[PDB]
Amino acid sequence: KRYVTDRRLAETLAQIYLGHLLLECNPGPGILTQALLEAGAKVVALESDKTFIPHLESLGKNLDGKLRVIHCDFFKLDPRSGGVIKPPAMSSRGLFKNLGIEAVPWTADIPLKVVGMFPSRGEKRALWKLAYDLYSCTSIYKFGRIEVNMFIGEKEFQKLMADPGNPDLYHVLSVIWQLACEIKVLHMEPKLYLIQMIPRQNLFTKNLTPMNYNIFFHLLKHCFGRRSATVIDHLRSLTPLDARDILMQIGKQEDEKVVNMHPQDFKTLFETIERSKDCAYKWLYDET
Amino acid sequence: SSVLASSPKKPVSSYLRFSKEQLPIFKAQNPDAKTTELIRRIAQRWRELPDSKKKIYQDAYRAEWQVYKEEISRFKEQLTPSQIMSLEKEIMDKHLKRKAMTKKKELTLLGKPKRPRSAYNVYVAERFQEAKGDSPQEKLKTVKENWKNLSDSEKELYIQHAKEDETRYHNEMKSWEEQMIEVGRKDLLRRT
């Protein structure tokens, strides 16, 4: 995997994160952990490789304070449709219960901060999993708007930050994450981008709720299935309502292309369809 | 207000350049010959022209194609969305007009009996020449008035000839439509 092995980078990161409780993912050799402890941070290390645990614990014993080392793979927490049968895999409810972290309302401020690096070959998987957890208000996001800072590759970074301004890289994950969080580049290490993802307070609305996000994901995947086609073409396969009327409601013309729609255009589209009043049903969603 | 007219056009190719420069000379030396023969002799001149001479025109065409690349690039990047839409509309409409003209002119090329002449058409054809009037419109209105003032007995010959042309058109329609069936074009037959 990826591990922070440079001391200078560890110090720079320590000053950035210090800028509360810090959850460090996959510390490995523990250079970043030691930099945080020297900088005065309160650290819980979620180490996926048990071989790294002793030294880290020793370092903690050097401080002998509130540092806590757990044998846990953050990217395998709470498996979807799983039987909960693994030591490295855990439940965020039990982990946070042991760490004494209490849930706060969505509107409340950031209760906890998680930092680390995406897997070198699992960036898309991790982004999708965290997206599901975020929009579903499960896992860590059951406790509030958790701030997540992660190192990511340049390709997935550009794809994540793309928009109609850069149509070739605009994708579903771009829409989901740009709507979900205010993403900001905190550091660039040659290329790896340390991205800060803070969930937006106003993500959920009267018509976009943790109860109907799945229909929105279905709409996004469906639309990006044929990115070159017209929006009305896809709408004719998603709702019995007048597709031209909806598109006009969201201020788009009939010839509007999918790649030209902004994330807020997608969100206002979904909310507009959900808002319809005089119909027995608004969506055609029926999939296992 | 036509974007297509201001769009940079493709440069003239080597041969077409040679013809564009030779044609005025051949026309000066042969003012009465038909353009057909001059273009033919110019093409033969091009075929007889040594490759080393054509190469000059080819190089000129290539440089003109580079400058055309720059011009078309800047132009396309300069067009606003509405201008792209109007250009697409002009392109589509022009294509539709091409199809309409080709199809109608085709239908005219196919030798088919003209539709039947009415008694009024017959009367206009017989009396137009002697009808007073300063223009064909005024003479046609005159023929219209004199027709409206005609009695039923004065019209008997024109109606008879109209019927006879009806039978003529019927028969010639049968024969021709059959001949079109031979050519495998049953779409031109009367529908029902």
Partner: protein
């Protein structure tokens, strides 16, 4: 006026001159498309179209290479059939100009045109002498060329003009199979007593006419067993709206069909290929009716776009075959032939000499009408996409549902991304779904191929003639490797398949009827309140956080649908006698063709059916009915037969009470292991004991005799394993030997060791190792390692064990399978030797890039179809559905190696079943087969057991392992290079495990071998 008229005339004449001037001026997918187009044009008689396309292709440099001699032969045969001598000569000119060589089919076309046109004996003679100089054979024309009876007649007429004394070979003397095991089946030496049906000849002719009408219509309308209550206004309004909408869709589909045929026709006028003639193969009214039927039957949840294309393609092909036979006179010849065939089965008719249905059928004729080869897969796919897209585009409906100006498509395709690769799906409009739900249509429609036949099926005479009278049916169900298995079924000697054909014909000839009382009760529960405890699905009213409730609701709806169809067909066949034609898989296992209603179904399904022809109980019929009853109850599985009979005598009062008052009495039957079958057996026993003479009661209820772990029986027989023979009741004993109990014990000791080691799954499985769990588990490992069809059933059986933590059910099923494997291999070391021998041999055979092939002891060739990596995709404006062509590159070594032993065992049990059926038929017994179970009348259970044991001993008495080893040696150890792999392969094949001491003859004396 003569001036103007003459001007018009002159212009017209000049126009005529202008008219004179205008008149003066290695198989491949595309090759498959073109050839299919040309062959298709012969059936629609659109010869000028195909000739136009062929000429265009020939005239182009790059297109001429695409043409093939077979195509030129196709157009040539078309012109020969039309008598266009000049155009046929022109085609011969194209053939000669393209070089290449003319063939027998070409000369047959020329002879056809000369005979039809009555050419001179000089031209015919000259043609026959040019054919003689070319080296072609006169007799090879009538034999090697596929020609209709009209082509044969015309060619004969042409030949008889020059050579009047030319006679075809004397035919048709059929040859008899000389197989070791079928010898006494086909030998005339012996007293045969083939059974006859209870229906008279005229009755069988009326039923044959009914079935013929049903197949000609291609549809079956059955009254629904639903719709007990109905709203007064809602159903009326929804029905009026639905009828109007169906008229609108009918008209719109007609117009769209004509417009599409026109478009494709113009595309043929251009240099492009199109499916025009394929749409001209079937009546437009039939196409519209088929599309409307598919729309009416489309599931509310939707159907895969590709799957729907396939279905439309299959129904199109079927209706085209039916139409062709209809218009080609094959129907009349089938009527005469079948009407003569019915003499063998009818009670009031006799035949000159006794014979099997296939033998008699071939004896009467046997022209067998004509065989039509199916279309290439790309044609099927493109046609399906055409019909589907046409239906979607043509069908519109207003969105207002329950002032409907707006129009939206009735069908809309949406996308499922569950599989990482999105697949197109066709979903109906929800307003349409609610419309059909409110309408509550009281009728259901089935395909004629999906319901039982109203007359005895056609005897299986070849791998392409069988089952329903007109509709073509494959001899082997297996779709994967269908080309290989079919081509090898036609490659093997025709006599080799005699046994299988006669067995399948025998199974199909079994007359069935519905149990009125059982149907009345099952419907009474279904029509009112369902009974999940008795396998009767409950209506949606009884459906029960939200996600779980929706899941349970969907499952209950599925089961409700299946039961609706099955019980509806049962009600339709209430007062009728019907037959179920049988089919085979690649392993040889037989399965009924009608899937909805057949004896292979659940307990309810098995209880709804009984033999149409009865059999007097005799001296032991009643005892066999009681023993069968106890077996169905499952209360005395371990007890001997005498104690089962005594127990039946004990609970006789509960039997009579259960029969008389099933739902109001003591309801004892509901406690049995098979409640509905047990109840039926109680009714039969009641009728028997309450009859004046129980020995003379004509009993119709079938009695079952099952082989416990038949696979382990075959392995114990192959290796002569005494421990195995004892475990699986091959060795005689007064009490039944339960291998599941011993295996459960050994697995219990292993579980004690692993549980002592601290393993979690072994700790949680403590006290759960039961007979049923290990019965289904062993039945899994024997019948199948991997491909978790049975594994899922085991998971279900564990999930129904309330006291088990459902988190380990998956891991617990895997662990149980592994422990059963290890245990069986420990207590049955010889079995491990045979299994490892076959497995390794298959591994080495497949490792050389060749699939494992063998021949059953009855002469049936079996080939494993597991292959991978064949794909090509079309694109209709624009989904791009993929397709798996029949051309395979590499075999799947894993599936082959794991599959060889169990598949071979399948061929062994199938061969045993077939021998039992064939020999039981000679004694006049009614025999049907469900997986391992053999059924017969209570009057003949003893005789059936005798035939079973005799045929088992005879089967395994041959050197099956030796013959198989030598077979694989000859077939796969012949490659001259490399020789090393053939030396290791031979080294493993000749390592046949030595047999044990067990005396196979003891099977003849084992009472509980099959019980």
């Amino acid at each position: 006026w003569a001036k103007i008229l003459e001007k018009d005339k002159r212009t017209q004449q000049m126009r005529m001159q202008r008219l004179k001037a205008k008149l003066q001026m290695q198989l491949s997918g595309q090759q498959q498309r073109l050839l299919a187009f040309f062959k298709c044009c012969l059936l629609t008689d659109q010869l000028p179209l195909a000739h136009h396309l062929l000429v265009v292709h020939h005239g182009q440099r790059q297109k001429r290479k695409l043409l093939t001699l077979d195509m030129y032969n196709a157009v040539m045969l078309g012109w020969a059939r039309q008598g266009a001598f000049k155009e046929l000569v022109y085609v011969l000119f194209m053939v000669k100009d393209a070089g290449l060589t003319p063939d027998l089919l070409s000369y047959a076309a020329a002879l056809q045109c000369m005979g039809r046109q009555d050419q001179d004996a000089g031209t015919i003679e000259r043609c026959l002498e040019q054919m003689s100089q070319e080296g072609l054979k006169l007799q090879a024309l009538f034999t090697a060329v596929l020609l209709s009876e009209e082509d044969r007649a015309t060619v004969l007429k042409a030949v008889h003009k020059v050579k009047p004394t030319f006679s075809l070979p004397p035919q048709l003397p059929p040859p008899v199979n000389t197989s070791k095991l079928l010898r006494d089946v086909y030998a005339k030496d012996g007293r045969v007593s083939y059974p006859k049906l209870h229906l008279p000849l005229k009755t069988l002719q009326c039923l044959f006419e009914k079935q013929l009408h049903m197949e000609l219509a291609s549809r079956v309308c059955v009254v629904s067993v639903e719709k007990p209550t109905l709203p007064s206004k809602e159903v009326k309004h929804a029905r009026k709206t639905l009828k109007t909408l169906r008229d609108q869709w009918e008209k719109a589909l007609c117009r769209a069909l004509r417009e599409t045929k026109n478009r494709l026709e113009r595309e043929v006028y251009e240099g492009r290929f199109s499916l025009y003639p394929f749409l001209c193969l079937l009546d437009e009214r039939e196409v519209v009716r088929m599309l409307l039927q598919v729309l009416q039957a489309l599931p509310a949840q939707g159907e895969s776009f590709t799957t729907l294309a396939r279905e439309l393609s299959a129904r199109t092909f079927s209706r085209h075959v039916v139409q062709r036979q209809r218009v080609s006179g094959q129907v009349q010849a089938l009527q005469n032939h079948y009407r003569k065939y019915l003499c063998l089965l009818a009670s009031d008719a006799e035949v000159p000499e006794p014979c099997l249905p296939r033998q008699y059928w071939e004896a009467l004729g046997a022209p067998e009408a004509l065989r039509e080869q199916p279309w290439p897969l790309p044609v099927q796919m493109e046609l399906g996409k055409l019909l589907a897209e046409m239906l979607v585009q043509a069908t519109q409906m207003p969105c207002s549902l329950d002032r409907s100006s707006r129009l939206v498509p009735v069908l809309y395709h949406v996308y499922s991304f569950r599989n990482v690769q999105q697949i197109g799906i066709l979903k109906p409009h929800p307003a349409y779904v609610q419309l059909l739900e409110k309408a509550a249509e009281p009728t259901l429609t089935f395909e004629a191929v999906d319901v039982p036949m109203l007359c005895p099926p056609l005897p299986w005479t070849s791998p392409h003639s069988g089952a329903f009278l007109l509709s073509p049916t494959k001899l082997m169900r297996t779709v994967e490797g269908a080309t290989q298995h079919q081509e090898l079924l036609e490659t093997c000697p025709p006599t080799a398949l005699h046994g299988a054909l006669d067995a399948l014909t025998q199974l199909g000839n079994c007359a069935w009827r519905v149990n009125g009382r059982v149907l009345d009760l099952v419907l009474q529960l279904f029509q009112a309140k369902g009974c999940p405890q008795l396998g009767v699905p409950a209506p949606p009213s009884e459906a029960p956080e939200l996600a779980h409730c929706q899941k349970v609701a969907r499952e209950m709806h599925s089961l409700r649908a299946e039961a609706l169809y099955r019980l509806s067909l049962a009600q339709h066949l209430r007062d009728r006698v019907f037959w179920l034609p049988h089919n085979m898989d690649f392993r040889g296992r037989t399965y009924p063709c009608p899937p909805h209603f057949n004896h292979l179904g659940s307990d309810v399904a098995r209880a709804l059916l009984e033999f149409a022809q009865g059999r007097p109980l005799g001296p032991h019929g009643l005892d066999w009915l009681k023993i069968h009853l106890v077996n169905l109850t499952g209360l005395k599985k371990r007890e001997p037969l005498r104690k089962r009979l005594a127990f039946a005598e004990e609970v006789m009062d509960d039997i009579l009470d259960s029969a008389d008052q099933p739902l109001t009495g003591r309801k004892w039957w509901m406690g049995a292991e098979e409640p509905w079958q047990t109840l039926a057996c109680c009714m039969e026993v009641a009728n028997a004991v309450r009859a004046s003479d129980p020995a003379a009661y004509v009993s119709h209820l079938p009695v079952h005799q099952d082989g416990s772990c038949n696979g382990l029986q075959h392995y114990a027989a192959l290796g002569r394993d005494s421990v195995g023979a004892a475990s699986v009741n091959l060795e005689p004993s007064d009490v039944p030997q339960d291998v599941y109990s011993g295996v459960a014990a050994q697995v219990e000791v292993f579980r004690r060791q692993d549980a002592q080691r601290g393993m979690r799954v072994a700790q949680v499985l403590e006290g759960f190792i039961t007979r049923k769990v290990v019965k289904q588990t062993v039945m899994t490992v024997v019948y199948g390692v991997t491909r978790y069809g049975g594994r899922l059933q085991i998971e279900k059986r564990l999930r129904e064990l309330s006291d088990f933590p459902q988190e380990f059910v998956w891991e617990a099923s895997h662990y149980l399978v592994r422990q059963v494997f290890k245990s069986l291999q420990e207590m049955f070391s010889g079995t491990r030797a045979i299994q490892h021998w076959l497995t390794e041999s298959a591994r080495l055979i497949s490792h050389m890039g060749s699939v494992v092939e063998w021949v059953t002891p009855l002469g049936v060739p079996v080939i494993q179809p597991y292959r991978l990596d064949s794909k090509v995709k079309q694109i209709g404006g624009s989904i791009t559905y993929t397709h798996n062509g029949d051309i395979s590159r590499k075999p799947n070594t894993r599936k082959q190696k794991n599959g060889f032993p169990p598949n071979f065992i399948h061929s062994l049990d199938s061969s045993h079943m077939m021998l039992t059926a064939l020999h039981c038929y000679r004694k006049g017994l009614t025999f049907v087969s469900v997986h391992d179970c053999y059924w017969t009348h209570a009057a003949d259970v003893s005789v059936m057991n005798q035939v079973c044991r005799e045929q088992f001993v005879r089967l395994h008495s041959e050197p099956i392992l030796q013959d198989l080893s030598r077979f694989l040696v000859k077939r796969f150890c012949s490659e001259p290079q490399k020789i090393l792999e053939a030396s290791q392969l031979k080294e493993t094949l000749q390592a046949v495990p030595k047999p044990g001491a067990f005396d196979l003859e003891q099977v003849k004396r084992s009472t509980y071998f099959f019980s």
